[PDB]
Each structure stands twice: as C-alpha cells, then as structure tokens.
C-alpha cells in the first residue's frame with residue numbers, strides 16, 4: 223500500500239482469500255469491513271500514528287459511531303480489489319473516514335463506504351468532543367475541500383435509524399464473542415457486530431439475495447462476558463430494521479438497516 | 486505465490502494484518518492456521534485442481550484427520566512471513582500436507598506444520614483407502630523421496646491422544662458457529678475448531694505463556710445447528726494440556742488434542 227501523490231489519501235490492493243468468501247465464492251461483507259479497517263490502519267501508520275501524542279497524553283481515543291457500506295459487486299475469490307481511503311474533519315463533532323473500492327482489472331467502482339468517528343476518554347468512556355489543539359494536528363493529513371464517498375444531499379448514509387419494537391420478526395439469541403473476535407487491545411472487533419446483525423437474517427434471504435447496503439450505529443460496546451441477542455424485522459428489494467441488545471437487561475449496543483437485491 | 490523451480494512445492498508471502506494479531510501484536514495461531522489453508526488452496530489451484538476429475542465423478546473429497554503446528558516465533562503485525570508447502574502420499578492410508586514458515590527478512594524457520602488427510606465419500610461420509618487410479622493422478626505433483634517437516638524419531642506430530650475424562654479442570658460451554666465460521670461449502674472451517682479448543686485455556690495462561698505446539702484430531706463435524714463444549718485439563722517452565730470438544734447434548738466427540746505452552 224501507499225499514500226497517493228498529494229499525500230492526502232491512501233491506496234492498497236488485496237487478493238481475496240479462500241476462507242474470505244461465502245457460498246457464491248465472492249468476499250463476504252465482513253471480509254470487506256475487515257479490509258476497510260486494514261487500509262485505515264495502514265493509512266494511519268504511513269503518516270506517523272490513530273491517536274496523536276497529545277491524545278495519548280490525555281487518554282483520548284477515536285471510536286466508531288456509525289459505519290455505512292454500499293457494494294455493487296463483491297470481488298470473487300482470487301480477484302484483486304483496490305481500496306482508496308481518506309479522512310476529513312467535520313468540526314468539533316468528529317471525523318469521517320471514507321473508502322472507495324475498485325476492481326483492479328477494469329478500474330470500475332465496485333463499492334463505497336463512510337464512517338463517523340468521535341473522541342472519547344479511554345477510561346471514563348465520556349465523549350467531550352474534538353478540541354482545538356488536537357484538531358490542528360490532524361488537519362495537515364486531510365483534504366481541505368470536501369471529498370465525499372456519498373455526496374448526494376440527504377443520502378442513505380445520513381438517515382436516522384429507529385429503534386426496533388418487540389416482538390421482532392426474526393431473532394438469533396445468546397451470541398457470545400470468542401478470542402478470535404477480539405482486537406489487540408482485547409476489545410470486540412467492530413466487524414463482529416456486523417456479523418451479529420446478519421445472524422438474524424433468514425437463510426432464504428441470504429440464498430436468494432445479495433446484500434447491497436448496510437448502515438450500523440454503535441452505541442455501547444459488548445464486553446468479553448456479555449451475551450447478545452440479534453433482532454430483525456422486515457420493513458419493505460428487501461429492507462430490514464436491526465437491533466443488537468445485551469441478553470439480560472436488554473441494553474442497546476447497536477441499531478442498523480440492510481437493503482438486499484434479488485440475485 | 487508460486488510453484489518452486491521443480492514444481493513439487495509452493496511458496497507464498499503474507500503481510501500480517503492489524504486484525505490478525507493478539508495482545509502481543511503478533512499473529513494468532515488461528516491466523517497462522519488460516520494462512521496454511523490459504524497457501525494449500527493456492528498450491529492446489531496452481532496445478533489444476535483439491536479433487537481430481539475422477540474424485541468429483543465418484544463424489545469423493547479430501548478431509549482433515551489431524552493438524553499439528555509448532556511455532557518458534559509468531560510474526561509481528563506488518564511483518565512478512567514466507568510459507569512453503571508440499572504434499573506426499575502415505576500409501577493407501579491417505580496423504581500428508583506439510584508447511585514451513587520463515588521470516589522473510591532473516592530467512593530463519595519460525596514454524597512448521599503437518600496434516601493428515603483421508604478420502605471420504607461426500608454424501609455417505611464413509612472413509613476409504615485411496616485407490617490406485619486416483620492415487621496415480623496425484624503422484625506427479627508430489628516429491629517421491631520422503632520430505633518431512635517433522636523428521637524426528639518419535640516426534641510430537643505422530644503421538645496418540647487420549648480421551649479426557651470428566652470432570653474436566655476447565656470448560657467453555659455452549660459454543661456455536663456463526664456465518665463467518667463457515668467455508669464456501671457452508672461447512673464449519675477447520676480453523677474454528679482450533680479456536681474452540683483454545684476457548685477453555687485460562688486467560689492467566691494466555692497472558693503469561695506463548696503457545697508452542699498444538700496437535701488436533703478431527704473425528705466428526707460440528708453442523709450449523711450443533712452446540713459445542715470445550716474441555717481442558719492440565720497434564721503437566723512449560724505447561725501441557727489435554728483437550729476435548731464434544732457436542733453439548735449427548736456428548737458425542739468431535740475433536741481431541743493437546744497444547745504445549747512456554748512461559749513468556
């Protein structure tokens with residue numbers, strides 16, 4: 223991978239692996255989400271990091287608030303997918319990281335994604351919002367003119383998501399993380415939550431449709447000893463409303479929506 | 486990746502990813518097992534496949550009976566690991582696939598692995614000794630002189646594993662696969678079973694030790710609707726454990742194994 227000519231975005235190519243594909247022999251949306259995370263980390267490394275020494279001193283970290291992914295064509299097993307990523311500050315609110323996925327052979331855009339990140343104290347888990355001196359440190363690595371993977375005014379990535387009301391149409395109960403679901407800091411990987419959302423989609427949908435769009439809000443983290451229930455109701459192409467909540471008290475951890483196109 | 490000069494082994498390099506590492510910022514044993522599977526798959530593709538046209542006609546597949554991995558140094562996040570793999574027939578019993586892992590910078594061997602595979606009818610699940618006509622088709626892609634990743638006299642890779650007796654010292658109950666644990670044929674990925682074995686190792690061991698050796702026997706498959714219990718008992722500067730995976734209800738065995746850990 224490498225920073226582009228202007229040093230304001232980063233590109234990396236990936237060969238889709240045999241264990242990374244589903245039954246149609248194309249990459250799963252979780253493999254795609256793992257690759258977006260990987261190119262995001264390689265971008266942060268290439269420019270000196272994604273916390274600055276200032277954030278590290280204040281015990282401040284970046285945390286995902288929302289992930290939105292739209293795929294037109296999933297890369298097949300053995301195909302090379304090229305991914306370009308960049309960041310942009312959105313004022314005191316937080317920062318956005320965008321991605322563009324392309325077929326390396328044709329050069330056509332096969333997917334796009336956008337995420338919203340907020341600053342949080344690592345210990346108290348309190349938000350606080352982006353400070354003046356911290357922001358300045360990041361500004362030099364972001365384009366100043368708006369560069370959006372989803373430019374359209376009031377598009378799918380910015381839509382408010384409602385809370386699913388019981389009884390849910392479908393559910394997968396008692397989902398628990400294992401060591402492979404944790405990251406290097408022993409926290410559940412953000413991609414695991416996407417997998418848990420998808421657990422309550424009926425197999426008949428998975429067999430006859432392809433996932434086109436997924437939007438997922440992150441409200442609270444699932445700890446190593448937590449148990450999750452994944453709820454799904456049809457709201458319609460097929461569209462679904464999703465809710466992840468901790469098995470006991472029913473505390474919400476995530477809410478989202480999915481849009482599926484008939485194969 | 487590419488077949489070597491003699492066309493009898495295959496090499497591929499991998500850059501360790503950020504989500505592939507544990508708390509030490511080095512690759513997990515499950516990341517390593519996934520990479521061995523990937524280089525095995527790329528080797529089969531580079532030579533025409535890992536079923537031959539005759540096996541597909543007969544509804545015959547290769548299935549793993551045993552996996553044995555020994556790691557000296559786990560590659561760090563960002564490091565390039567080079568893996569060489571080859572196959573050898575072991576008569577009518579079945580075939581063996583071996584791997585050698587190396588640090589791409591130093592050229593030193595950082596790990597090695599060996600696996601035993603048997604032929605099985607895909608539908609009846611019945612095992613069979615490898616026939617001559619099928620065997621002959623594979624022989625041209627394997628070295629004829631023995632090439633072993635574990636040459637040693639009574640090496641760890643060939644040791645018989647006993648059945649853990651209740652009560653187990655440690656256990657992780659109610660483990661279930663999710664869609665990410667399945668392969669392209671909707672079967673639980675062989676690496677998931679390694680993860681499930683490791684689930685019952687106490688966190689204190691994981692924090693103070695590094696996994697050196699894991700040997701795992703595969704007896705039966707966990708289906709999509711099955712639930713698994715992972716049992717572990719200490720059998721021992723080094724810690725050794727006996728492992729058992731069994732289906733949560735009736736207690737039917739799916740896997741047995743052993744692990745050896747060295748103090749960090």
Ligand SMILES: N#Cc1ccccc1O
Pocket residue numbers: 265266269271272309310317360363364
């Ligand atoms: N904000 C921000 C940012 C920009 C370039 C690379 C890494 C980052 O976290």
Ligand SMILES: N#Cc1ccccc1O
Pocket residue numbers: 399400401403404446684688
């Ligand atoms: N997640 C998780 C986890 C952590 C330590 C032991 C077992 C687990 O499933």
Ligand SMILES: N#Cc1ccccc1O
Pocket residue numbers: 528529532534535571572573574580623626627
């Ligand atoms: N047996 C065997 C074998 C050898 C080279 C590549 C793939 C194989 O299944």
Ligand SMILES: N#Cc1ccccc1O
Pocket residue numbers: 421425662663664666667709710
């Ligand atoms: N394993 C598995 C699985 C298959 C279909 C739906 C949900 C699942 O966890």
